[PDB]
Amino acid sequence: MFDGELIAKMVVELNAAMTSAQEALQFPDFEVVQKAQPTQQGTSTRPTIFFQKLFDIPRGWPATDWHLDNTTRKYVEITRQHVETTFQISSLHWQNPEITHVVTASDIANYVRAYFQARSTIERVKELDFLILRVSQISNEAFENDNHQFEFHPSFDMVVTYNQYIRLYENAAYSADGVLIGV
Amino acid sequence: MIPGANLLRMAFGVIGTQIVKYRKFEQRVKNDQAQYVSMFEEPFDLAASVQRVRRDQYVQFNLEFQRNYVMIFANFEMVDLDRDVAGDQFLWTGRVFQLESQGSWFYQDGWGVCLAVDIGAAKLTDDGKPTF
Question: Count of CB atoms within 10 A of residue B48's CB?
Fold first, then answer.
């Protein structure tokens, strides 16, 4: 019930990180896209950042709070589950040998990581209802693109922690009818 | 010259020809959630031969699937998936198809052959026409 809103907020933050990445070092434009496109649509020549969902690890038992609706005398139970999702964040930017202001795709991924681990961005993301854990590795790997050249597709896993709320119903009671029996 | 001219144009003289509703890619933008949304040119009728391809059912994740294929020979420039470009789309028998392979031959000869997958049922117009 949250991956839509989370993906929207993550897209906003990723586009902000790309706008900042345009300032320190320079690329021709950028894009931020989801890797598994639900319809047939191509990879972009421009330097882009991809993101994808990988896991979802619930953390701790669900916490159930009880809220009275006061109208129908029904205890609405609110089950909050803490969630650590894992986002595979990758980058793609072909390297031109002729140009001199070179910025490999590993560097764009590294800047995204370092931006998303700074304390100010952490506090902003906190104000946007989730947070970010540590990124412990950035894997720069080589492959062949469709032009039979060599390209790097670095990627790292970013753990994003938040809560998701479930609303259900339960019956209330305002009485105590005991039976005091004698041994 | 034979690799010039148009071999499919003369081949259409003897064999029959189906009419498909072709539609060409125009631009493509990211909506919210970073998925791209494709948009296209105006649809237009195309004269083509749409032969079958043997489609076989398979199993994935313990379910059963099947990919529906048609091989279209058309006298037009047909482009599928490309860097910064999405594939084209044609309507036939109330079914949407998008190109998957690309037999080229256009700039050589003017015609082309493409393998196209089915996508789903067509939208039905108020008058009953099987077009979007």
Answer: 26
Contact B41, B85 (CB under 8 A): no
Query: Residue A5's Cα: distance from chain center in Å?
Result: 10
Name which of A7, A34, A43 is nearest B83 (Cβ-Cβ).
Answer: A43
SS3 of residue B122 by DSSP: coil
Experimental method, per PDB record: cryo-EM
Distance from CA of B57 to the nearest CA of A (A): 21
Which of the residues A31, A32, A41 would you substitute to probe the B interface, choosing the one with the greatest number of B C-beta atoms within 10 Å?
Answer: A41
Task: Find residue A161's DSSP bridge partners.
Answer: A84, A131
